[PDB]
Amino acid sequence: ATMTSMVSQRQDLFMTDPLSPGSMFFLPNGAKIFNKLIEFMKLQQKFKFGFNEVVTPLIYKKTLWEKSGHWENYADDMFKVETTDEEKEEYGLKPMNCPGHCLIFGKKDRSYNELPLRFSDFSPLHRNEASGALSGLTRLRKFHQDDGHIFCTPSQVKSEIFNSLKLIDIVYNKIFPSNYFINFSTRPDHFIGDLKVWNHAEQVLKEILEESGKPWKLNPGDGAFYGPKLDIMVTDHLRKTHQVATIQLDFQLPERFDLKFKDQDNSYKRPIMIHRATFGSIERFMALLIDSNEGRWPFWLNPYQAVIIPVNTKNVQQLDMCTALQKKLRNELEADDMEPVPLNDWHFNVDLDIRNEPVGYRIKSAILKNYSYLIIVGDEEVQLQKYNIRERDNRKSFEKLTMSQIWEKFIELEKNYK
Amino acid sequence: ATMTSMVSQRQDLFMTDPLSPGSMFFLPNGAKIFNKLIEFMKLQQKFKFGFNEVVTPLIYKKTLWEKSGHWENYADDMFKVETTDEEKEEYGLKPMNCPGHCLIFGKKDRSYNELPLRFSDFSPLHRNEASGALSGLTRLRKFHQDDGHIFCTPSQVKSEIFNSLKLIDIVYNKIFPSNYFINFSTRPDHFIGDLKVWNHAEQVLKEILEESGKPWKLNPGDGAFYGPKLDIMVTDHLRKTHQVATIQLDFQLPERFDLKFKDQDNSYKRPIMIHRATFGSIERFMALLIDSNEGRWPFWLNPYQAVIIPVNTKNVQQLDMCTALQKKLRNELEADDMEPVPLNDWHFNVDLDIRNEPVGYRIKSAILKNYSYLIIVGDEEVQLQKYNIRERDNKSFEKLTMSQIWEKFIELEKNYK
RNA sequence: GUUAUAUUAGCUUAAUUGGUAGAGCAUUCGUUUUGUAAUCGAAAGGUUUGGGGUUCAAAUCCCUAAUAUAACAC
RNA sequence: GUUAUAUUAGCUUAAUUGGUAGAGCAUUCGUUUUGUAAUCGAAAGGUUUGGGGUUCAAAUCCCUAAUAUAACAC
Numbered sequence A: 001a002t003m004t005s006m007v008s009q010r011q012d013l014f015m016t017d018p019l020s021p022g023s024m025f026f027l028p029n030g031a032k033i034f035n036k037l038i039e040f041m042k043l044q045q046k047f048k049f050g051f052n053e054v055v056t057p058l059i060y061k062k063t064l065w066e067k068s069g070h071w072e073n074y075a076d077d078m079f080k081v082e083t084t085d086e087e088k089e090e091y092g093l094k095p096m097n098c099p100g101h102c103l104i105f106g107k108k109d110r111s112y113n114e115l116p117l118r119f120s121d122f123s124p125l126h127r128n129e130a131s132g133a134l135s136g137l138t139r140l141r142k143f144h145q146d147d148g149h150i151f152c153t154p155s156q157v158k159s160e161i162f163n164s165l166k167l168i169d170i171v172y173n174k175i176f177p178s179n180y181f182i183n184f185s186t187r188p189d190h191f192i193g194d195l196k197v198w199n200h201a202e203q204v205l206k207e208i209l210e211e212s213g214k215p216w217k218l219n220p221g222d223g224a225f226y227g228p229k230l231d232i233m234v235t236d237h238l239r240k241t242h243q244v245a246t247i248q249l250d251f252q253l254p255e256r257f258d259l260k261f262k263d264q265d266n267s268y269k270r271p272i273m274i275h276r277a278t279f280g281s282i283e284r285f286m287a288l289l290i291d292s293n294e295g296r297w298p299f300w301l302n303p304y305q306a307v308i309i310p311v312n313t314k315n316v317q318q319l320d321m322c323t324a325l326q327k328k329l330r331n332e333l334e335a336d337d338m339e340p341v342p343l344n345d346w347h348f349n350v351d352l353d354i355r356n357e358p359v360g361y362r363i364k365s366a367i368l369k370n371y372s373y374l375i376i377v378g379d380e381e382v383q384l385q386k387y388n389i390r391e392r393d394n395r396k397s398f399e400k401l402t403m404s405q406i407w408e409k410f411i412e413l414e415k416n417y418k
Numbered sequence B: 001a002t003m004t005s006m007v008s009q010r011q012d013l014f015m016t017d018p019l020s021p022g023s024m025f026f027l028p029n030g031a032k033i034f035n036k037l038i039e040f041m042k043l044q045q046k047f048k049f050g051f052n053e054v055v056t057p058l059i060y061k062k063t064l065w066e067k068s069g070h071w072e073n074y075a076d077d078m079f080k081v082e083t084t085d086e087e088k089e090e091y092g093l094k095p096m097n098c099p100g101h102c103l104i105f106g107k108k109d110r111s112y113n114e115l116p117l118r119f120s121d122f123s124p125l126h127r128n129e130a131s132g133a134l135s136g137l138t139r140l141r142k143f144h145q146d147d148g149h150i151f152c153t154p155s156q157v158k159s160e161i162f163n164s165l166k167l168i169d170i171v172y173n174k175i176f177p178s179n180y181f182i183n184f185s186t187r188p189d190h191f192i193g194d195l196k197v198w199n200h201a202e203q204v205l206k207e208i209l210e211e212s213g214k215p216w217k218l219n220p221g222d223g224a225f226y227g228p229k230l231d232i233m234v235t236d237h238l239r240k241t242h243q244v245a246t247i248q249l250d251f252q253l254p255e256r257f258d259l260k261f262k263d264q265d266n267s268y269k270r271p272i273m274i275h276r277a278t279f280g281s282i283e284r285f286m287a288l289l290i291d292s293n294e295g296r297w298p299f300w301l302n303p304y305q306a307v308i309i310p311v312n313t314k315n316v317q318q319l320d321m322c323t324a325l326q327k328k329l330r331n332e333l334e335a336d337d338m339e340p341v342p343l344n345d346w347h348f349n350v351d352l353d354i355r356n357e358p359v360g361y362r363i364k365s366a367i368l369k370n371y372s373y374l375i376i377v378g379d380e381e382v383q384l385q386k387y388n389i390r391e392r393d394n395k396s397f398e399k400l401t402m403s404q405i406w407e408k409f410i411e412l413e414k415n416y417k
Numbered sequence C, D: 001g002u003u004a005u006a007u008u009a010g011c012u013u014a015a016u017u018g019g020u021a022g023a024g025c026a027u028u029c030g031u032u033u034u035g036u037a038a039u040c041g042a043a044a045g046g047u048u049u050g051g052g053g054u055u056c057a058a059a060u061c062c063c064u065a066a067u068a069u070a071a072c073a074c
């Protein structure tokens, strides 16, 4: 939070305003990061773990929330929506995507052949959290979940949760590095449904925990009102734990919505529903990212990937060399004709500091902003037609690379999420 | 509407529900189109027209909306938000992004050196439209604008507006094919600001209209309460006109929020604001596409890009050849290892219909869904190790290798075809 | 929400015990043309989060509203 | 919001200005192994958008709520 605010000020990441407490503004550099993470998650979800993104309403009539049980469970924690006409039924601004995905499931007849049916959803969610509980980006009033719900059969539940934990291991152990433990969170005192169903639901998660081999801890009575959950817990540099990813086993909402599919014996069965998020919310995940990296973004995430600095800022040969590298790496098009920007090209975040200042000043400035690479161009470089390029960390080990070597180096960096 | 509904049912695009009137559900196939359009627009805005995307709140306190003028003026159209507390100040769910973008501009000291300053915003908007004016995807209560606001100087206004017209032309004249005319929508009965400022704002748009050479007509009293505008009008197949893209010249909101920047003379000046959108709303734009194409999407947009049909659904050599092409074209990874999906690969929407049914039935099914391509595999194809591939909009067949189909689809997607 | 503590220019901050709102960084202009962590100079930016009061005088004391941070509550 | 019309199985629809809901597509299983616009068969899916009223009897008539389509209003 204090760390978040320092990095945000240095890098122009975010802003807040009392005219909308607990909602973030992502400034252009903040949104660059936000979007890259979403792009990353969407790729894994659509093209590896078999998810299908939907786009759902944000407001729903009171009746819907009464059906799902939320209007009950979270009555104060829900923002209410009204029209100028006092006769119409009131609305709720959504704090969860799941009743909407239940409406989708049950709008048409479903066949066992389309299960597991996996829906992802990146809608903004609103929760009227207690003002005293709000905190930077970790606990907000408006936030974005990398949300998904799976509809499946009893025999599918375990592999679906193991797949969900695979994606969690890819995020927290491989791409964004022991790294977490699981809270097994059981039946709360306010719950819906039969104690026998709840007991069976807890039984499943217990056996999954055992087979997974992963470290875990009982977290009594902190389950969702509709189901027990596996809560993935990360520790920040002050030894504080934070719930991010989560897998929730839900036998209750399919019952509230009377969800049905037809199986091979030509009869109707009730699906089981799995709630799941891997980032948790994009905002909280970003806060923990910053807490750990202190502004030192990996190359592929960095809103400041390289800066180019000419020793002599009014020298034509240096300038022309700097500009040409910038045009190459940004890979943009001019606004004055009609050729459109193609899909799936590379574009890198490369700036050109030609302020009339000593080189050491501009370098100092770029180090404070945590540029991944520093590219200096002087008369030596103009002769060689190579650029002098420095990584953020290794101040000593320079390289002299051509235009195309830097291009290829950067592409290789993004391919490998490095 | 009619047409939208039929096509939506055939391709499982969208869904509605009385529990949220005037909001769309995009089913997986609908959402694929939605996201591809946004993807297209973001590339143009970021790598050609110098926009920077922002993500902003959805709800703001009454006070903000009173300062912007929306509270008095767009009083009917605004959903109110409240909490259980009731001593707290009321919120409005946003019908526009503009005041959020003014808060961002005004939040920190600004220099003339960062102008033109261009924010793009794709946030969901809500307006409480009259129930009797609601219609399919053209008029909704919730919708997404490809919104943008430009902050600039007086000498920059014309070139910034010409650049917006350039993006409009790429969209309506080249990628998604006079294609439109412009409504010059002037000062409404209820407006904010000075008469003298309004007159100057209309003078500027008149001159632009002249210099642009484009067809236009007067649309009296139809401006926004904060500015006159140029409204891009397209005509549907029943000859009814629809407003899509729009360009709005705003002197008033910067005065309301007292925005300023510092110029070369170390002095404070007020920026001018241009409002713009090119699709208008993604929803209304999709609606007009469907009206135009009757569900026959161009390849790069089609949720149904190719279907693969084995003649003999239990013949192992025919299945292997179908399955191998699907894997190539879809280019997906398996969920059992730790290897992540890399950025900027190609992936195509390719299905395998192995239903134990006559070839002609499966082909009729695929034609009804308007697949761009139909790929048949029989014994002939196994011998040749080539696939029989037929276009939707055509008689003529081709026999191509796996690799040729891959490259063909990439060239179609590359050239937005 | 409650308790505590705060809110001073875009950011960070000073104002000896109510008595001069003062700097640094960033910005604008001039100057310097610079080889891997800060050329030099000037200008501008404040009525101290908003609204009331007390006093000859308020950033400082009193009432109120709003946020933020931290704990609790939930 | 007003006016008109409508709401029947996932979808499209039929049903003596009152008489006791039928089918096509899709789905599930069986059958067919199919060469470019629909193999054959069976099963399941309806208490007619919600609520109230009239009647011996309501998909049908009346009132009302919700939504959709169209036009107007804005």
Ligand SMILES: C[C@@H](O)[C@H](N)C(=O)NS(=O)(=O)OC[C@H]1O[C@@H](n2cnc3c(N)ncnc32)[C@H](O)[C@@H]1O
Residues within 6 Å of the ligand: A095, A096, A097, A098, A127, A129, A137, A138, A139, A140, A141, A142, A143, A145, A147, A148, A243, A244, A245, A246, A275, A276, A277, A279, A280, A281, A283, A284
């Ligand atoms: C996973 C969803 O489908 C499920 N219905 C759900 O909402 N679970 S949740 O309430 O526990 O939210 C999941 C994660 O969102 C994040 N989250 C929850 N509330 C907030 C908040 N107020 N601000 C920021 N992030 C939050 C946490 O990481 C949490 O683990």
Ligand SMILES: C[C@@H](O)[C@H](N)C(=O)NS(=O)(=O)OC[C@H]1O[C@@H](n2cnc3c(N)ncnc32)[C@H](O)[C@@H]1O
Residues within 6 Å of the ligand: B096, B097, B098, B127, B129, B137, B138, B139, B140, B141, B143, B145, B147, B148, B149, B243, B244, B245, B246, B248, B275, B276, B277, B279, B280, B281, B283, B284
């Ligand atoms: C362009 C924005 O920055 C500006 N503030 C604005 O809101 N202009 S607007 O009101 O005219 O909206 C622009 C476009 O959104 C689309 N739009 C407006 N209202 C709706 C609606 N109720 N449903 C669907 N699309 C809408 C139209 O295409 C319209 O041209």
Ligand SMILES: [Zn+2]
Residues within 6 Å of the ligand: A096, A097, A098, A149, A275, A276
């Ligand atoms: Zn959920």
Ligand SMILES: [Zn+2]
Residues within 6 Å of the ligand: B096, B097, B098, B148, B149, B275, B276
């Ligand atoms: Zn606007």
